Nucleic acid binder design. Structure first.
Ligand code: NA
Ligand code: NA
Ligand code: NA
Length: 223
DNA sequence: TGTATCTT
DNA sequence: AAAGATAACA
């Protein structure tokens, strides 16, 4: 079915044979059979399809997917045309235009162009029941996305991790703070953006850190 | 009504 | 665990 990127499957397929993951996917399937679950099944792992795992430079970690129709498509905070940017993404764009002087609102919500540059656009929980934020927490996704973070922590060098919100910040303990850069702030949702996201300057700080590590910076305007 | 984080 | 409070801004 070509839903998992090859390089990701190579390093993460060990999780597929573990009971927690088997039982997790059974739970999601039972949810789909009685409720609407987002994103659609072929888009749960879009974040594996945008770049090689060895080419990841930045990890943006959010909480869980958008819970409204036609919004989530497997890249955190992104929406496919023609759906308008949800409030969280409008807040991201709004921080981008104060933080990055060249950034202007791109007129859509598809962040695939960041992912193609090596920005991993991950959520801690990768499915959600329609209309109920974080309804699929504590079911097994956190152990899977822990394995993602742990692989990058151990096999990469000089990554920038942006942990947005309390649930994403639970991954901080798994990251070697002397070998990677961890920036943390509040979630960009309107319900929390006022607790630090506006003013966090994570996008310029990310490029500063990449620069100093001798890596190419993210062109936040490309997407 | 719609989109987190804290307290009990 | 979860209801309700707190929070801000359409
Ligand atoms: Na297990
Ligand atoms: Na479904
Ligand atoms: Na999403």
């Amino acid at each position: 079915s070509h839903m998992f990127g090859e390089s990701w499957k190579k390093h993460l397929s060990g999780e597929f044979g573990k009971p927690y993951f088997i039982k997790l996917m059974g739970f999601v399937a039972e949810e789909r059979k009685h409720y609407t679950v987002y994103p659609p099944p072929h888009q749960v792992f879009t974040w594996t399809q945008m770049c090689d795992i060895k080419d990841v430079k930045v990890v943006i970690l959010g909480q869980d997917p958008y819970h409204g129709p036609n919004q989530a498509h497997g890249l955190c905070f992104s929406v496919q045309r023609p759906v308008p940017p949800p409030p969280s993404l409008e807040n991201i764009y709004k921080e981008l235009s104060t933080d990055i002087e060249d950034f202007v609102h791109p007129g859509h919500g598809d962040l695939s162009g960041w992912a193609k540059q090596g920005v991993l656009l991950l959520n801690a929980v990768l499915t959600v029941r329609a209309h109920q934020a974080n309804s699929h927490k504590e079911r097994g996704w956190e152990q899977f996305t822990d394995a993602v973070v742990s692989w990058l922590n151990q096999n990469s060098n000089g990554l920038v991790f942006l942990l947005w919100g309390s649930y994403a910040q639970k991954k901080g303990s798994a990251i070697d703070r002397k070998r990677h850069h961890v920036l943390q702030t509040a979630h960009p949702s309107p319900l929390s953006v006022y607790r630090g996201f506006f003013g966090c300057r994570h996008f310029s700080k990310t490029n500063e850190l990449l620069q100093k590590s001798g890596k190419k910076p993210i062109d936040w305007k490309e997407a």
